[PDB]
Amino acid sequence: APMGSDPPTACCASYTARKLPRNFVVDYYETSSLCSQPAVVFQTKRSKQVCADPSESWVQEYVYDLELN
Numbered sequence: 001a002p003m004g005s006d007p008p009t010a011c012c013a014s015y016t017a018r019k020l021p022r023n024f025v026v027d028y029y030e031t032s033s034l035c036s037q038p039a040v041v042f043q044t045k046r047s048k049q050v051c052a053d054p055s056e057s058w059v060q061e062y063v064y065d066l067e068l069n
Contacts, residue, residue: 011035012051016042020050022062 009032020042029041029049040059042050052059 009034012039012041015039015051015053020044022065028063028066
């Protein structure tokens with residue numbers, strides 16, 4: 001059929017089990033609205049995208065600090 005077996009839109013299979021200071025991050029990215037498990041991505045300068053459990057608090061912290069200057 002047209003649609004593949006399990007073609008993802010903008011979700012994540014695994015998150016990051018470490019810490020990444022906001023200073024060491026360029027921008028962020030959100031997941032589509034098809035998956036039943038939201039995830040906040042964080043594109044790194046040298047590293048690729050970084051998924052983080054939105055449930056955590058540290059996530060919202062950086063998301064707010066980014067807007068602040």
